[PDB]
């Protein structure tokens, strides 16, 4: 996928 | 000021688009395609800065979807990166765990946040909490 | 677990709070601490080390640790910075030459990551002569309005008169305690 | 001020107010609001630096009034984060574009040289852009980075390589032209297809 991941991971 | 800011995914799909310069629709599409090709055809050690068409084409994506900005050669390069990071942080705070799927569904909200943050390519809200509070108040109006 | 004992203690008052006594020498910090603890203008020798005292007001025992403004005692304020929840800066509006030194000391004290939860507490000491500035000129000179993430308030307190100490204590209590 | 120069004199009277505002902002190194990466009001600081660089660019009073602020910012700012590096670059650009003191120019040159050795691609690009902008100004001091400019041509960054080539072209003088001719020919022979025409 790779779309559900957070943009900044915070 | 920022001539145009567009959010494009890794596969080439564009999740956001905001140009502060009036250009033809065909010309705008060609410029967006060229920017996507340059970003898609650039490595991770290119400094995230491209001087395309005499514009500071700065590409810096923290996830699969990347972000691009076009500013004139009259300000520092790090300022654009700082503004992009601040906008990303504000969007994440407004949404909460912002992902690629949420960006497509929240296109109107993202456009409203971008309009309330930067207007005409220039910075309009230096603070990060005031802009969020204003966006929340506008959303709560109905 | 049960919190019945905590509720019973809080029903009649259990909060105490803390405070700090720092500033330049001859700035009324020792006099301010004596007025808070005792309430009289008593002449004392310069604080070579530090003064420890507690004041009970509004059911809260706000202990203030007075620190001298001496050169040999200025660097000793870091010892009291450990396990400290408040910080009070003593300004000398009547000492123009020492105003810069007091401002530098306040900036150095506030420029430490350890002293971050303690809000700014600036008291306009020496408020008995016409040369004393107002509550806005001192803050503007010290740049307290630009200290973000710090609850700093400018209050004018005269050691000889004692007026303004209650306002400063109330401001400190409001900054520390945010309950009804 | 940038649109017309008639308001430069009228807008130059507020230089002390801007200097005082910048000093007050620098005094508070933390910011609950707008303070990111340890820099409080980075946008405000950048705007102040840009105004100082564009204000009094051909006057001595304006440069002298903001000389102390520029000196304080050049030494009271940490470039560990991106905001600090951008602020330092903006201050260096303002000092170079204004009639600053010799010490300010030396400090700006030292900052540019230090940023040139940084391994970050963005930092290297910023240093190359600053060197290219400060080509005519402090040209003698820019000659100390000839080795860095030559090495930037072989860098694996398209933007970095372009900046290095531009700096080398702008740094060609009447004495290093003969020496730099061989380097330019070698770069053109072994250059990218998009840079061969530009190199020629
Ligand atoms: N007489 C008088 N003295 C004042 C007044 N306001 C402030 N002061 C100062 O308060 C000082 C009292 O001295 P201390 O009790 O030792 O307290 P301090 O000012 O912190 O001095 P140190 O303890 O040595 O740091 C005097 O030396 C005065 O300079 C005032 O209204 N009248
Ligand atoms: Mg004392």
Coordinates of C-alpha atoms and ligand atoms in Angstrom, one line a residue:
Chain A
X1 CA 0.0 0.0 0.0
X2 CA 2.2 2.8 1.3
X3 CA -0.7 5.3 1.4
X4 CA -2.1 4.7 4.9
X5 CA 1.3 5.5 6.4
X6 CA 1.7 8.9 8.2
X7 CA 3.3 11.7 6.2
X8 CA 5.6 12.5 9.2
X9 CA 5.0 9.5 11.5
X10 CA 4.2 11.6 14.6
Chain B
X1 CA 6.1 34.2 -3.2
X2 CA 5.3 30.6 -4.1
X3 CA 4.3 30.5 -7.8
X4 CA 2.7 27.1 -7.4
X5 CA 2.5 24.3 -4.9
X6 CA 1.2 20.8 -5.9
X7 CA 1.2 17.6 -3.9
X8 CA 2.0 14.6 -6.2
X9 CA 2.2 10.9 -5.2
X10 CA 5.1 8.6 -6.0
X11 CA 3.1 6.9 -8.8
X12 CA 2.5 10.3 -10.4
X13 CA -1.0 11.0 -9.2
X14 CA -1.5 14.5 -7.9
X15 CA -3.3 14.8 -4.5
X16 CA -3.1 18.6 -4.3
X17 CA -2.6 21.6 -6.6
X18 CA -2.5 25.3 -5.9
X19 CA -0.9 27.7 -8.4
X20 CA -0.6 31.4 -7.6
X21 CA 0.2 32.4 -11.2
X22 CA -2.5 32.6 -13.8
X23 CA -1.5 30.2 -16.6
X24 CA -3.4 28.4 -19.4
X25 CA -5.0 25.1 -18.6
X26 CA -2.9 23.3 -21.2
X27 CA 0.2 25.2 -20.1
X28 CA -0.5 24.4 -16.5
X29 CA -1.0 20.7 -17.2
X30 CA 2.2 20.6 -19.2
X31 CA 4.1 22.4 -16.3
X32 CA 2.6 19.9 -13.8
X33 CA 3.6 17.0 -15.9
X34 CA 7.1 18.3 -16.3
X35 CA 7.4 18.9 -12.6
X36 CA 6.2 15.4 -11.9
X37 CA 8.7 13.9 -14.4
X38 CA 11.6 15.9 -12.9
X39 CA 10.6 14.8 -9.4
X40 CA 9.9 11.2 -10.5
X41 CA 13.3 11.2 -12.4
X42 CA 15.4 12.6 -9.5
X43 CA 17.3 10.8 -6.8
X44 CA 17.3 11.1 -3.0
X45 CA 20.7 12.8 -3.0
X46 CA 19.8 15.7 -5.3
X47 CA 19.4 18.1 -2.3
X48 CA 15.6 18.4 -3.1
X49 CA 16.3 21.6 -5.0
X50 CA 15.8 22.0 -8.8
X51 CA 16.4 25.2 -10.8
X52 CA 13.7 24.6 -13.4
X53 CA 12.5 27.5 -15.5
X54 CA 14.4 29.9 -13.2
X55 CA 12.2 28.7 -10.4
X56 CA 13.3 27.2 -7.1
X57 CA 11.6 23.8 -7.7
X58 CA 12.0 22.3 -4.3
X59 CA 10.7 18.8 -3.9
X60 CA 10.6 17.3 -0.4
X61 CA 8.2 14.4 0.4
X62 CA 8.2 12.8 3.9
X63 CA 6.0 9.9 2.6
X64 CA 4.9 8.2 -0.6
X65 CA 3.1 11.3 -1.7
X66 CA 5.7 14.1 -2.4
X67 CA 5.3 17.9 -2.3
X68 CA 6.7 20.5 -4.7
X69 CA 7.0 24.2 -4.5
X70 CA 8.0 26.9 -7.0
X71 CA 9.4 30.2 -5.7
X72 CA 11.3 33.0 -7.2
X73 CA 15.1 33.3 -6.8
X74 CA 14.8 36.1 -4.2
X75 CA 14.6 34.3 -0.9
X76 CA 16.6 31.6 1.0
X77 CA 16.1 28.0 0.0
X78 CA 15.6 26.7 3.5
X79 CA 12.7 29.0 4.0
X80 CA 10.6 27.1 1.5
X81 CA 11.5 23.8 3.2
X82 CA 10.6 25.2 6.6
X83 CA 7.3 26.5 5.3
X84 CA 6.5 23.1 3.8
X85 CA 7.3 21.4 7.0
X86 CA 5.1 23.8 9.0
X87 CA 2.2 23.3 6.6
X88 CA 2.6 19.5 6.8
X89 CA 2.6 19.7 10.6
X90 CA -0.4 21.9 10.6
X91 CA -2.3 19.6 8.3
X92 CA -1.4 16.6 10.4
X93 CA -2.6 18.4 13.6
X94 CA -5.8 19.4 11.9
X95 CA -6.5 15.9 10.6
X96 CA -4.7 13.5 12.8
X97 CA -2.4 10.8 11.4
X98 CA -2.7 12.1 7.8
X99 CA -2.2 9.5 5.1
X100 CA -2.6 9.3 1.4
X101 CA -6.1 8.0 1.6
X102 CA -7.2 10.8 3.9
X103 CA -5.8 13.4 1.6
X104 CA -7.9 12.4 -1.3
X105 CA -11.1 12.2 0.8
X106 CA -10.2 15.6 2.5
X107 CA -9.3 17.5 -0.7
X108 CA -11.7 20.3 0.1
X109 CA -10.5 20.5 3.7
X110 CA -6.8 20.5 2.5
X111 CA -7.6 23.3 0.0
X112 CA -9.4 25.3 2.7
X113 CA -6.4 24.9 5.1
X114 CA -3.9 25.9 2.4
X115 CA -6.0 29.0 1.5
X116 CA -6.2 29.9 5.2
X117 CA -2.5 29.4 5.6
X118 CA -0.8 30.9 2.5
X119 CA -2.6 33.3 0.2
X120 CA -1.0 34.5 -3.1
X121 CA 2.1 32.4 -2.5
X122 CA 3.1 34.3 0.6
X123 CA 3.0 33.3 4.3
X124 CA -0.2 34.5 6.0
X125 CA -0.1 32.7 9.3
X126 CA 3.3 32.6 11.0
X127 CA 1.9 30.9 14.1
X128 CA 0.8 27.2 14.1
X129 CA -1.9 27.3 16.7
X130 CA -3.7 30.5 15.5
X131 CA -4.2 29.0 12.0
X132 CA -5.5 25.7 13.5
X133 CA -7.9 27.6 15.7
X134 CA -9.2 29.7 12.8
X135 CA -9.6 26.6 10.7
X136 CA -11.5 24.8 13.4
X137 CA -13.8 27.9 14.0
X138 CA -14.5 28.1 10.2
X139 CA -15.3 24.4 10.1
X140 CA -17.6 24.6 13.1
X141 CA -19.6 27.4 11.4
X142 CA -21.3 25.0 9.0
Chain C
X1 CA -7.2 1.7 44.2
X2 CA -9.1 4.3 46.2
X3 CA -8.8 8.0 46.2
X4 CA -11.1 8.8 49.1
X5 CA -8.2 10.0 51.2
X6 CA -7.1 12.4 48.4
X7 CA -10.6 13.7 48.0
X8 CA -10.9 14.3 51.8
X9 CA -7.6 16.1 51.9
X10 CA -8.5 18.3 48.9
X11 CA -11.9 19.1 50.4
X12 CA -10.3 21.2 53.2
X13 CA -7.2 22.2 51.2
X14 CA -4.1 20.1 50.4
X15 CA -2.3 22.1 47.7
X16 CA 0.8 23.9 48.8
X17 CA 2.7 25.2 45.7
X18 CA 6.3 26.5 45.4
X19 CA 8.1 29.7 44.6
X20 CA 11.7 31.0 44.0
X21 CA 13.5 34.1 45.2
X22 CA 16.1 35.2 42.7
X23 CA 17.4 38.6 41.4
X24 CA 20.1 41.1 41.6
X25 CA 21.7 42.2 44.9
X26 CA 20.0 45.1 46.7
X27 CA 16.8 44.4 44.6
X28 CA 14.5 43.8 47.6
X29 CA 14.5 40.0 47.1
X30 CA 15.4 39.4 50.7
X31 CA 13.1 42.1 51.8
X32 CA 10.3 40.7 49.7
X33 CA 10.8 37.2 51.1
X34 CA 10.8 38.6 54.7
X35 CA 7.6 40.5 54.0
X36 CA 6.0 37.4 52.5
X37 CA 7.1 35.3 55.5
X38 CA 7.0 37.8 58.4
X39 CA 5.5 41.1 57.0
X40 CA 8.0 43.7 58.3
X41 CA 10.9 45.7 56.8
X42 CA 13.8 44.2 58.8
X43 CA 17.4 45.2 57.9
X44 CA 19.6 42.1 57.3
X45 CA 23.1 41.5 56.1
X46 CA 23.6 40.5 52.4
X47 CA 22.6 37.0 51.6
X48 CA 26.0 35.3 51.0
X49 CA 24.4 32.0 50.6
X50 CA 20.6 31.5 50.3
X51 CA 17.5 32.1 52.4
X52 CA 14.8 29.4 52.8
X53 CA 11.3 30.4 54.0
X54 CA 7.7 29.5 53.5
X55 CA 4.6 31.6 53.2
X56 CA 1.0 30.3 53.7
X57 CA -1.7 32.1 51.7
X58 CA -5.0 31.0 50.3
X59 CA -4.5 27.6 52.0
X60 CA -1.3 27.1 49.9
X61 CA 2.2 27.1 51.5
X62 CA 4.2 28.8 48.7
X63 CA 7.8 28.3 49.9
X64 CA 10.2 30.8 48.5
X65 CA 14.0 30.1 48.4
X66 CA 15.7 33.5 48.5
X67 CA 18.9 33.7 46.4
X68 CA 21.4 36.5 46.7
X69 CA 22.6 38.6 43.8
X70 CA 26.2 38.4 44.7
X71 CA 28.8 37.2 42.2
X72 CA 29.8 34.3 44.4
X73 CA 26.2 33.4 45.0
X74 CA 24.8 34.0 41.5
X75 CA 26.1 30.7 40.1
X76 CA 24.8 28.9 43.2
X77 CA 21.2 29.4 42.1
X78 CA 21.5 26.2 40.0
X79 CA 21.5 24.1 43.2
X80 CA 18.0 25.4 44.0
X81 CA 16.9 24.8 40.4
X82 CA 16.5 21.1 41.1
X83 CA 13.1 20.1 42.3
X84 CA 11.9 23.7 41.8
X85 CA 8.5 24.5 40.4
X86 CA 8.6 28.3 40.5
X87 CA 11.0 31.1 39.8
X88 CA 10.8 34.8 40.9
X89 CA 13.1 37.4 39.5
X90 CA 13.8 40.5 41.5
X91 CA 14.3 43.6 39.4
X92 CA 16.0 46.8 40.5
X93 CA 14.3 49.7 38.8
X94 CA 16.4 52.2 40.9
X95 CA 19.7 50.7 39.7
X96 CA 20.1 51.6 36.1
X97 CA 23.7 50.3 36.0
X98 CA 22.7 47.0 37.6
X99 CA 19.5 46.8 35.4
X100 CA 21.5 45.3 32.6
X101 CA 23.2 42.8 35.0
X102 CA 19.8 41.8 36.4
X103 CA 18.3 41.4 32.9
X104 CA 21.3 39.2 31.9
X105 CA 21.0 37.1 35.0
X106 CA 17.2 36.6 34.4
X107 CA 17.9 35.6 30.7
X108 CA 20.6 33.2 31.8
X109 CA 18.2 31.6 34.4
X110 CA 15.4 31.4 31.9
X111 CA 17.7 30.0 29.2
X112 CA 17.9 26.6 30.9
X113 CA 15.9 23.6 29.9
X114 CA 15.6 22.5 33.5
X115 CA 13.8 25.8 34.5
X116 CA 11.0 25.5 31.9
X117 CA 7.9 24.8 34.0
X118 CA 8.5 27.8 36.3
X119 CA 6.7 30.9 35.0
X120 CA 8.4 34.3 35.0
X121 CA 7.9 36.3 38.2
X122 CA 9.3 39.8 37.8
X123 CA 8.7 42.2 40.8
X124 CA 9.4 45.9 40.4
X125 CA 11.4 46.3 43.5
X126 CA 12.4 49.7 44.9
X127 CA 9.0 51.2 44.2
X128 CA 9.5 54.1 46.6
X129 CA 11.3 56.7 44.7
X130 CA 10.2 58.8 41.6
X131 CA 13.1 57.2 39.6
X132 CA 11.3 53.8 39.6
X133 CA 9.7 52.9 36.3
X134 CA 6.1 51.7 35.7
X135 CA 4.9 48.2 35.1
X136 CA 5.3 48.4 31.3
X137 CA 8.7 50.2 31.0
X138 CA 10.5 47.6 33.1
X139 CA 8.9 44.7 31.2
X140 CA 9.7 46.4 27.8
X141 CA 13.3 46.9 28.9
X142 CA 13.6 43.3 30.2
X143 CA 11.8 41.9 27.1
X144 CA 9.3 39.9 29.1
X145 CA 6.6 40.2 26.4
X146 CA 8.9 38.2 24.0
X147 CA 9.4 35.3 26.4
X148 CA 7.1 32.7 24.7
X149 CA 6.1 29.6 26.6
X150 CA 6.6 31.5 29.9
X151 CA 3.9 33.1 32.1
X152 CA 5.8 36.3 33.0
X153 CA 3.9 39.1 34.7
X154 CA 5.3 42.5 35.7
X155 CA 4.2 43.7 39.2
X156 CA 5.4 46.7 41.1
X157 CA 6.1 46.0 44.8
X158 CA 7.7 48.3 47.3
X159 CA 9.5 46.7 50.2
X160 CA 9.0 49.7 52.5
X161 CA 5.3 50.0 51.8
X162 CA 4.4 46.3 51.1
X163 CA 1.9 47.2 48.4
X164 CA 1.8 44.9 45.4
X165 CA 3.1 41.8 47.2
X166 CA -0.4 40.4 47.4
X167 CA -1.0 40.9 43.7
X168 CA 2.3 39.1 42.9
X169 CA 1.4 36.2 45.2
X170 CA -2.0 36.0 43.6
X171 CA -0.5 36.0 40.1
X172 CA 2.0 33.3 41.2
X173 CA -0.8 31.2 42.6
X174 CA -2.9 31.5 39.5
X175 CA 0.1 30.6 37.3
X176 CA 0.8 27.5 39.5
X177 CA -2.7 26.5 40.6
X178 CA -5.4 26.5 37.9
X179 CA -8.4 25.2 40.1
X180 CA -11.5 26.8 41.6
Chain D
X1 CA 10.2 49.3 -1.2
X2 CA 10.9 46.8 -4.0
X3 CA 8.2 48.2 -6.3
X4 CA 9.5 51.8 -6.3
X5 CA 12.4 53.5 -4.6
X6 CA 10.4 56.6 -3.7
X7 CA 9.2 55.0 -0.4
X8 CA 12.7 53.8 0.5
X9 CA 13.5 57.0 2.3
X10 CA 10.1 57.0 4.0
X11 CA 10.4 53.3 4.8
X12 CA 14.0 53.7 5.9
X13 CA 13.0 55.8 8.9
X14 CA 11.5 52.7 10.6
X15 CA 14.9 50.9 10.6
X16 CA 15.4 51.5 14.3
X17 CA 12.0 50.0 15.0
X18 CA 12.7 47.0 12.9
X19 CA 16.1 46.5 14.6
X20 CA 14.4 46.8 18.1
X21 CA 11.8 44.2 17.1
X22 CA 14.4 41.8 15.7
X23 CA 16.5 42.2 18.9
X24 CA 13.4 41.5 21.1
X25 CA 12.5 38.4 19.0
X26 CA 16.1 37.2 19.2
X27 CA 16.1 37.7 23.0
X28 CA 13.4 35.1 23.4
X29 CA 15.0 32.0 22.0
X30 CA 11.9 29.9 22.7
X31 CA 8.3 30.1 21.2
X32 CA 5.2 28.3 22.2
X33 CA 3.6 29.6 19.0
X34 CA 5.6 29.7 15.7
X35 CA 8.7 28.3 17.5
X36 CA 9.7 25.2 15.6
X37 CA 13.1 23.4 15.9
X38 CA 14.3 25.8 18.6
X39 CA 13.8 28.9 16.4
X40 CA 11.0 31.3 17.5
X41 CA 9.2 33.1 14.7
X42 CA 11.5 31.8 11.9
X43 CA 9.3 33.5 9.3
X44 CA 9.4 36.8 11.1
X45 CA 13.2 36.5 11.5
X46 CA 13.5 35.8 7.7
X47 CA 11.3 38.7 6.9
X48 CA 13.3 41.0 9.2
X49 CA 16.6 39.8 7.6
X50 CA 15.2 40.4 4.1
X51 CA 14.0 43.9 5.0
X52 CA 17.4 44.7 6.5
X53 CA 19.2 43.4 3.4
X54 CA 16.9 45.4 1.1
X55 CA 16.8 48.4 3.4
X56 CA 19.8 50.7 3.2
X57 CA 21.6 48.6 0.6
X58 CA 23.3 51.8 -0.8
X59 CA 23.3 53.8 2.4
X60 CA 25.7 53.8 5.3
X61 CA 23.3 54.9 8.1
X62 CA 20.9 52.0 7.4
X63 CA 23.8 49.5 7.3
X64 CA 25.3 50.9 10.4
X65 CA 22.0 50.8 12.3
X66 CA 21.5 47.1 11.5
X67 CA 25.2 46.2 11.7
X68 CA 24.8 45.4 15.4
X69 CA 21.7 43.3 14.8
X70 CA 23.4 41.4 12.0
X71 CA 26.4 40.8 14.1
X72 CA 24.3 39.5 17.0
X73 CA 22.3 37.2 14.7
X74 CA 25.4 35.9 13.0
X75 CA 26.7 34.7 16.4
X76 CA 23.5 34.2 18.5
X77 CA 21.9 31.8 16.0
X78 CA 22.4 28.0 15.8
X79 CA 22.4 26.4 12.4
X80 CA 21.9 22.9 13.6
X81 CA 18.4 22.7 12.2
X82 CA 17.1 23.7 8.8
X83 CA 15.5 26.9 10.2
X84 CA 18.8 28.0 11.7
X85 CA 20.7 27.3 8.6
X86 CA 18.1 29.3 6.5
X87 CA 18.3 32.2 9.0
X88 CA 22.1 32.2 8.8
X89 CA 22.0 32.1 5.0
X90 CA 19.5 35.0 4.9
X91 CA 21.7 37.0 7.3
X92 CA 24.8 36.3 5.2
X93 CA 22.9 37.4 2.0
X94 CA 21.7 40.6 3.7
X95 CA 25.2 41.4 4.9
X96 CA 26.7 40.8 1.4
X97 CA 23.9 42.8 -0.4
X98 CA 24.3 45.7 2.1
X99 CA 27.2 48.0 2.9
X100 CA 28.3 46.0 6.0
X101 CA 31.5 46.2 7.9
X102 CA 34.7 44.2 7.1
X103 CA 34.1 42.0 10.1
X104 CA 30.5 41.2 8.9
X105 CA 31.8 40.3 5.5
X106 CA 34.5 38.1 6.9
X107 CA 31.9 36.3 9.2
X108 CA 29.6 35.8 6.2
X109 CA 32.5 34.4 4.1
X110 CA 33.4 32.0 7.0
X111 CA 29.8 30.9 7.3
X112 CA 29.6 30.3 3.6
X113 CA 32.8 28.3 3.6
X114 CA 31.6 26.2 6.6
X115 CA 28.3 25.5 4.9
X116 CA 30.1 24.5 1.7
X117 CA 31.8 21.6 3.5
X118 CA 28.4 20.4 4.8
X119 CA 27.4 17.0 3.4
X120 CA 23.8 18.0 3.1
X121 CA 22.6 18.5 -0.5
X122 CA 20.4 21.4 0.4
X123 CA 23.2 23.0 2.5
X124 CA 25.6 22.6 -0.4
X125 CA 23.1 24.1 -2.8
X126 CA 22.5 27.1 -0.5
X127 CA 26.3 27.6 -0.1
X128 CA 26.8 27.5 -3.9
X129 CA 23.9 30.0 -4.4
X130 CA 25.4 32.3 -1.8
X131 CA 28.8 32.1 -3.4
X132 CA 27.3 32.8 -6.8
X133 CA 25.4 35.8 -5.5
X134 CA 28.5 37.1 -3.7
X135 CA 30.7 36.8 -6.9
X136 CA 31.3 40.5 -7.7
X137 CA 31.2 41.4 -4.0
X138 CA 34.1 39.8 -2.0
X139 CA 35.5 38.3 -5.2
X140 CA 39.0 38.0 -3.7
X141 CA 37.6 36.2 -0.7
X142 CA 35.7 33.9 -3.0
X143 CA 38.9 32.7 -4.7
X144 CA 39.7 30.6 -1.5
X145 CA 36.9 28.2 -2.5
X146 CA 38.3 27.4 -5.9
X147 CA 39.0 23.8 -4.9
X148 CA 35.4 23.5 -3.5
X149 CA 34.0 25.0 -6.7
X150 CA 36.1 22.5 -8.8
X151 CA 35.0 19.6 -6.7
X152 CA 31.3 20.6 -6.9
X153 CA 31.5 20.1 -10.7
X154 CA 32.1 16.4 -10.1
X155 CA 29.4 16.1 -7.4
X156 CA 26.6 13.6 -7.9
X157 CA 23.9 16.3 -7.6
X158 CA 22.5 18.0 -10.7
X159 CA 21.6 21.1 -8.8
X160 CA 25.0 21.0 -6.9
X161 CA 26.8 20.5 -10.2
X162 CA 25.0 23.3 -11.9
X163 CA 25.8 25.6 -8.9
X164 CA 29.4 24.7 -9.0
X165 CA 29.6 25.3 -12.8
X166 CA 28.0 28.7 -12.4
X167 CA 30.3 29.6 -9.6
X168 CA 33.3 28.5 -11.6
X169 CA 32.1 30.6 -14.6
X170 CA 31.4 33.6 -12.5
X171 CA 34.8 33.3 -10.7
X172 CA 36.8 33.3 -14.0
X173 CA 39.2 36.4 -14.0
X174 CA 41.9 37.7 -16.2
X175 CA 44.6 35.7 -14.4
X176 CA 42.9 32.3 -13.7
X177 CA 41.2 32.2 -17.2
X178 CA 44.2 30.4 -18.7
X179 CA 44.4 28.0 -15.8
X180 CA 40.6 27.5 -15.7
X181 CA 40.4 26.9 -19.4
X182 CA 41.7 23.4 -19.1
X183 CA 39.3 22.6 -16.3
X184 CA 36.4 24.1 -18.3
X185 CA 37.4 22.0 -21.3
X186 CA 37.6 18.8 -19.2
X187 CA 34.2 19.5 -17.7
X188 CA 32.7 20.1 -21.1
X189 CA 34.2 17.0 -22.5
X190 CA 32.9 14.8 -19.6
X191 CA 29.8 16.8 -18.8
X192 CA 26.1 15.8 -18.9
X193 CA 24.2 16.2 -22.1
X194 CA 22.1 19.1 -20.6
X195 CA 25.3 20.8 -19.3
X196 CA 27.6 20.3 -22.4
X197 CA 25.9 23.1 -24.3
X198 CA 25.8 25.4 -21.2
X199 CA 29.5 24.6 -20.5
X200 CA 30.4 25.4 -24.1
Ligands
LIG1 N1 15.0 51.3 52.2 C1 14.5 50.7 51.2 N2 15.2 49.7 50.6 C2 14.6 49.1 49.5 C3 13.4 49.4 49.0 N3 13.0 48.7 48.0 C4 14.1 47.8 47.7 N4 15.1 48.0 48.7 C5 16.3 47.3 48.7 O1 16.2 46.1 49.4 C6 17.4 45.7 50.0 C7 17.2 44.8 51.2 O2 18.3 44.0 51.4 P1 18.2 42.4 51.6 O3 17.2 42.1 52.7 O4 19.5 41.8 51.9 O5 17.5 41.8 50.3 P2 18.2 42.0 48.8 O6 17.7 43.2 48.2 O7 17.8 40.8 47.9 O8 19.8 42.0 49.0 P3 20.6 40.6 49.1 O9 19.9 39.6 50.1 O10 22.0 40.8 49.6 O11 20.7 39.9 47.7 C8 18.0 47.1 50.4 O12 19.4 47.0 50.4 C9 17.5 48.0 49.3 O13 18.5 48.3 48.4 C10 12.7 50.4 49.7 O14 11.5 50.8 49.3 N5 13.2 51.1 50.8
LIG2 MG1 18.2 38.3 50.3

